[model samples]
Target: MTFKLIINGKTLKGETTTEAVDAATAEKVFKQYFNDNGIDGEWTYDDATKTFTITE
Candidate 1:
């Protein structure tokens, strides 16, 4: 349940670790990557944190 802002193929300063990853941050990452590439969106939001047994 965490996120790191990655720009230009490098990890950025802004990050989030939460109980959930909502639709908003999902869109944020998508847009970021899109901007990085400048013309694509073939991506996958495939993390299943809720379904998995996770620990710190």
Candidate 2:
């Protein structure tokens, strides 16, 4: 399945073997990568848009 990840208004897409994943998992991964790069941040899920909004 496809994960359309948006970080701080930017879009980044990734694929996973599992077809379904919860939003919390996505948030964990997103925050991990962002923090690893010395870019600390958080993201929010918008059910209306089925997309994420990021802040650093």
Candidate 3:
């Protein structure tokens, strides 16, 4: 499994001293949509890669 944070327009891979996200991060991103207007996303991993994606 893996973790990630989608910031701005680019995907920020977590564990890189990671706006980063996992289940928690994605929740933050989704919440921002309510008032903040713009935010990033979250993700998972593929083992081979190190990251997978979460919908928000």
Candidate 4:
């Protein structure tokens, strides 16, 4: 499955991953990604779109 990462409704380019991961794993990956990139926000996962959205 492909997963997308968005920040404040803007798609984070080049950050999408197609790794056949579950929602929980995806969330973890996104959280680590955000921390590594110094992004701070509240994360919400959309199962339908397999998208992780972070809102500040």
Per-residue error for 29 in candidate 1, Å, reads 1.3
Better of 1 and 2 by lDDT: 2
All models: lDDT? Answer: 0.38, 0.49, 0.39, 0.66
Q: Where is the poorest 10-residue window by lDDT in model 3?
A: 10-19
Instruction: Give per-residue CA lDDT, model 1, range 1-56, as digits (tens).
Output: 44433222233322333433675655465445435544332333435442211111
How do all models score by TM-score?
A: 0.31, 0.36, 0.25, 0.55
> What lDDT score goes with residue 50 in model 4?
72
Give candidate 1's TM-score. 0.31
Off by over 4 Å in 4: 9-17, 20-27
Top-lDDT structure, candidate number:
4
lDDT of 2 by residue, 1-56 (tens): 22444555345433222223765676556545444445346765566645555666
From the highest lDDT down, the ranking of the candidates is: 4, 2, 3, 1
**In what order do the candidates fall by TM-score, top score first?**
4, 2, 1, 3
Tens-place lDDT digits, model 3, residues 1-56: 23443333334322221334475564455444322433334433334444333444
Candidate 4 colliding pairs, count: 0
lDDT of 3 at 5: 32
Pick by TM-score: 2 or 4, better one: 4
Candidate 3 residue pairs in backbone clash: 44-52, 45-51, 45-52
Better of 2 and 3 by lDDT: 2
